[PDB]
Design a protein around this motif. Structure first.
Motif, mmCIF file in Angstrom:
data_model
loop_
_atom_site.group_PDB
_atom_site.id
_atom_site.type_symbol
_atom_site.label_atom_id
_atom_site.label_comp_id
_atom_site.label_asym_id
_atom_site.label_seq_id
_atom_site.Cartn_x
_atom_site.Cartn_y
_atom_site.Cartn_z
ATOM 1 N N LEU A 93 0.810 -1.203 0.000
ATOM 2 C CA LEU A 93 0.000 0.000 0.000
ATOM 3 C C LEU A 93 0.839 1.247 0.000
ATOM 4 C CD1 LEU A 93 -2.542 1.135 2.742
ATOM 5 C CD2 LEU A 93 -1.906 2.330 0.651
ATOM 6 N N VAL A 94 0.824 1.964 -1.109
ATOM 7 C CA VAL A 94 1.263 3.357 -1.120
ATOM 8 C C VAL A 94 0.096 4.340 -0.929
ATOM 9 C CG1 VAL A 94 2.340 5.150 -2.472
ATOM 10 C CG2 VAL A 94 3.081 2.728 -2.688
ATOM 11 N N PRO A 95 -0.088 4.852 0.305
ATOM 12 C CA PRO A 95 -1.196 5.661 0.853
ATOM 13 C C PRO A 95 -1.185 7.165 0.527
ATOM 14 C CG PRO A 95 0.462 5.366 2.520
ATOM 15 C CD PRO A 95 0.968 4.634 1.314
ATOM 16 N N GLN A 96 -2.279 7.855 0.863
ATOM 17 C CA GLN A 96 -2.437 9.260 0.457
ATOM 18 C C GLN A 96 -1.274 10.090 0.966
ATOM 19 O OE1 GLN A 96 -7.062 10.683 0.359
ATOM 20 N NE2 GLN A 96 -5.567 11.836 -0.908
ATOM 21 N N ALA A 97 -0.665 10.846 0.054
ATOM 22 C CA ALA A 97 0.544 11.622 0.341
ATOM 23 C C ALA A 97 1.495 10.921 1.335
ATOM 24 C CB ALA A 97 0.178 13.020 0.814
ATOM 25 N N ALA A 98 1.937 9.720 0.962
ATOM 26 C CA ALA A 98 2.898 8.968 1.760
ATOM 27 C C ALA A 98 4.274 9.568 1.540
ATOM 28 C CB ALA A 98 2.890 7.493 1.375
ATOM 29 N N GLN A 99 4.347 10.529 0.623
ATOM 30 C CA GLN A 99 5.548 11.334 0.496
ATOM 31 C C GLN A 99 5.915 11.898 1.869
ATOM 32 O OE1 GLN A 99 5.196 14.425 -2.305
ATOM 33 N NE2 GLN A 99 4.708 12.967 -3.968
ATOM 34 N N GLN A 100 4.947 12.542 2.511
ATOM 35 C CA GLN A 100 5.140 13.067 3.848
ATOM 36 C C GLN A 100 5.800 12.073 4.819
ATOM 37 O OE1 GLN A 100 1.395 14.576 5.236
ATOM 38 N NE2 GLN A 100 1.143 16.023 3.525
ATOM 39 N N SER A 101 5.703 10.771 4.538
ATOM 40 C CA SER A 101 6.360 9.758 5.380
ATOM 41 C C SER A 101 7.844 9.565 5.019
ATOM 42 C CB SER A 101 5.616 8.422 5.325
ATOM 43 O OG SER A 101 5.879 7.741 4.113
ATOM 44 N N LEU A 102 8.320 10.383 4.092
ATOM 45 C CA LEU A 102 9.726 10.411 3.756
ATOM 46 C C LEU A 102 10.367 11.502 4.563
ATOM 47 C CD1 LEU A 102 9.785 10.164 -0.144
ATOM 48 C CD2 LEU A 102 10.545 8.428 1.542
ATOM 49 N N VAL A 146 19.400 8.156 -7.392
ATOM 50 C CA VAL A 146 18.219 8.279 -6.562
ATOM 51 C C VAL A 146 18.478 7.769 -5.143
ATOM 52 C CG1 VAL A 146 15.768 7.658 -6.308
ATOM 53 C CG2 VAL A 146 16.653 8.222 -8.546
ATOM 54 N N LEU A 147 18.982 6.542 -5.034
ATOM 55 C CA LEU A 147 19.160 5.934 -3.719
ATOM 56 C C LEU A 147 20.011 6.830 -2.834
ATOM 57 C CD1 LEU A 147 19.903 2.180 -4.570
ATOM 58 C CD2 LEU A 147 17.969 3.012 -3.200
ATOM 59 N N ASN A 148 20.883 7.595 -3.479
ATOM 60 C CA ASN A 148 21.909 8.339 -2.783
ATOM 61 C C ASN A 148 21.556 9.811 -2.664
ATOM 62 O OD1 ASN A 148 25.404 9.165 -3.258
ATOM 63 N ND2 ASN A 148 24.340 8.586 -1.367
ATOM 64 N N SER A 149 20.301 10.140 -2.940
ATOM 65 C CA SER A 149 19.849 11.518 -2.785
ATOM 66 C C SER A 149 18.817 11.640 -1.670
ATOM 67 C CB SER A 149 19.303 12.061 -4.106
ATOM 68 O OG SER A 149 18.331 11.186 -4.651
ATOM 69 N N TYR A 150 18.506 12.878 -1.298
ATOM 70 C CA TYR A 150 17.538 13.141 -0.236
ATOM 71 C C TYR A 150 16.201 13.533 -0.840
ATOM 72 C CZ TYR A 150 21.700 13.231 2.693
ATOM 73 O OH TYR A 150 22.881 12.907 3.316
ATOM 74 N N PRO A 151 15.105 13.089 -0.199
ATOM 75 C CA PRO A 151 13.731 13.314 -0.649
ATOM 76 C C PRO A 151 13.557 14.701 -1.247
ATOM 77 C CG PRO A 151 13.680 12.134 1.399
ATOM 78 C CD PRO A 151 15.140 12.357 1.082
ATOM 79 N N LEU A 152 13.918 15.713 -0.471
ATOM 80 C CA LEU A 152 13.786 17.096 -0.902
ATOM 81 C C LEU A 152 14.363 17.386 -2.294
ATOM 82 C CD1 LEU A 152 14.223 18.717 2.583
ATOM 83 C CD2 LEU A 152 12.132 18.169 1.267
ATOM 84 N N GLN A 153 15.297 16.554 -2.752
ATOM 85 C CA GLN A 153 15.943 16.766 -4.046
ATOM 86 C C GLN A 153 15.171 16.125 -5.184
ATOM 87 O OE1 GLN A 153 19.758 15.231 -1.679
ATOM 88 N NE2 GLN A 153 20.175 15.531 -3.865
ATOM 89 N N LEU A 154 14.016 15.542 -4.879
ATOM 90 C CA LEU A 154 13.236 14.853 -5.895
ATOM 91 C C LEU A 154 11.943 15.584 -6.206
ATOM 92 C CD1 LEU A 154 13.327 11.258 -4.358
ATOM 93 C CD2 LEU A 154 15.081 12.337 -5.761
ATOM 94 N N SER A 155 11.542 15.532 -7.473
ATOM 95 C CA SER A 155 10.248 16.054 -7.886
ATOM 96 C C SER A 155 9.129 15.156 -7.359
ATOM 97 C CB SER A 155 10.183 16.140 -9.405
ATOM 98 O OG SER A 155 10.551 14.904 -9.986
ATOM 99 N N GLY A 156 7.914 15.694 -7.301
ATOM 100 C CA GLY A 156 6.764 14.908 -6.890
ATOM 101 C C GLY A 156 6.589 13.661 -7.744
ATOM 102 N N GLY A 157 6.838 13.795 -9.047
ATOM 103 C CA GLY A 157 6.823 12.655 -9.947
ATOM 104 C C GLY A 157 7.817 11.594 -9.511
#
Ligand SMILES: Nc1ncnc2c1ncn2[C@@H]1O[C@H](COP(=O)(O)OP(=O)(O)OP(=O)(O)O)[C@@H](O)[C@H]1O
Ligand code: SF4
Ligand SMILES: [Mg+2]
Length: 310
Positions: A93-102, A146-157
């Motif tokens: 399950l990838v849940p609603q705005a689970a981005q926030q869980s990063l 990717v593996l070696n970057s921080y969430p903030l450095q990624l687009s929503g896509g």
């Protein structure tokens, strides 16, 4: 095959002034390699049904009644020892705005590790890098960068791509996605959908996903389940839904897609019987005195509406 039978699911939110009757009596059958879409407007119970199904409800939410059968065995009422083997491994399950869980002071590789660790399985850090890279590729990402970057450095896509890769990590048989594409520009929303189609074909999985945009569903789905104010109002194949929409609410949607008078129902104090009656142009007495029964009709089709019958 039916890979998942939801039977009579009542799930509510306990609140000061009483209960919130999102997900109110909900029964539907997920076809074993289908793509089912759960569709409805804002705040109508979509994420609530998803969460109830996955026992991921908040401390707030409580399940009043019903079953959910995976391989004919009830997920609710399961020994957590028996649950832990089913979780990421089988259902994911990838849940609603689970981005926030990063958490964003962490390299992505770490959210992978956190995940893997949490769900028991023990892998050598390098092995983990393998597997992770592999699914990162499935989602068309640069595993290294990717593996070696921080969430903030990624687009929503990209965050979204990561989240999916994460879900796929343990080769699940069902993949469940909530508002996977919202808060996400047109174009990249399109790319996510494409990707979802790609994985659809390239993998053997049941795919359940939630959306508020019918367009998106028809882009992706075999069967479609329409929810209105905490109720499962209708369930057909996509094409049928557009061709021959049954529930007045649904019709309204399809027409309004070629702008429905009324306001959405309070879920604390909903209307009686059929919660759509106050807006429904075919409303009757029985529609206010009685909740229309979830019924089977013809072929794939289901409705809950007094206008119809077996
Ligand atoms: N923990 C909670 N306590 C009380 N009410 C809640 C809780 N979570 C959700 N609700 C309410 O129940 C209703 C259904 O919420 P839900 O999240 O299922 O809708 P949705 O279909 O996901 O729409 P959206 O995702 O766009 O908000 C909403 O009005 C929502 O605010
Ligand atoms: S049940 Fe009665 S009110 Fe609700 S949609 Fe069918 S007809 Fe309109
Ligand atoms: Mg939602």
């Amino acid at each position: 095959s039916i890979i998942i039978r939801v039977e009579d699911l009542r799930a509510v939110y306990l609140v000061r002034e009483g209960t919130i009757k999102a997900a109110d009596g909900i029964s539907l059958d997920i076809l074993e390699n289908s793509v089912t879409a759960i569709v409805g407007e804002s705040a109508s119970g979509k994420s609530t049904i998803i969460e109830a199904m996955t026992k991921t409800l908040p401390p707030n939410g409580r399940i009043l009644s019903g079953r959910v059968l995976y391989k004919g065995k009830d997920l609710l009422t399961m020994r957590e020892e028996e649950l832990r083997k089913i979780r990421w491994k089988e259902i994911a399950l990838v849940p609603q705005a689970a981005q926030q869980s990063l958490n964003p002071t962490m390299k992505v590789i770490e959210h992978f590790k956190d995940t893997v660790e949490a769900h028991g399985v023990r892998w050598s850090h390098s092995e983990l890098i393998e597997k992770a890279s592999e699914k990162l590729r499935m989602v068309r990402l640069n595993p290294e960068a990717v593996l070696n970057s921080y969430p903030l450095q990624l687009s929503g896509g990209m965050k979204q791509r990561v989240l999916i890769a994460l879900a796929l990590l343990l080769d699940p048989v069902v993949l469940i996605l909530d508002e996977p594409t919202s808060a996400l520009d047109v174009l990249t929303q399109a790319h996510i959908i494409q990707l979802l189609k790609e994985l659809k074909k390239m993998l053997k999985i049941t795919l359940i996903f939630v959306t508020h945009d019918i367009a998106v569903a028809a882009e992706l789905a075999d069967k479609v389940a329409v929810i209105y104010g905490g109720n499962l109002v209708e369930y057909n194949s996509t094409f049928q839904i557009f061709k021959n929409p049954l529930h007045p609410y649904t019709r309204g949607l399809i027409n309004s897609i070629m702008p429905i008078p009324g306001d959405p129902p309070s879920l604390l104090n909903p209307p009686s019987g059929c919660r759509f009656h106050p807006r429904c142009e075919y409303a009757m007495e029985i529609c206010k005195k009685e909740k229309p029964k979830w019924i089977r009709l013809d072929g794939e089709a289901h409705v809950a509406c007094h206008l119809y019958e077996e």
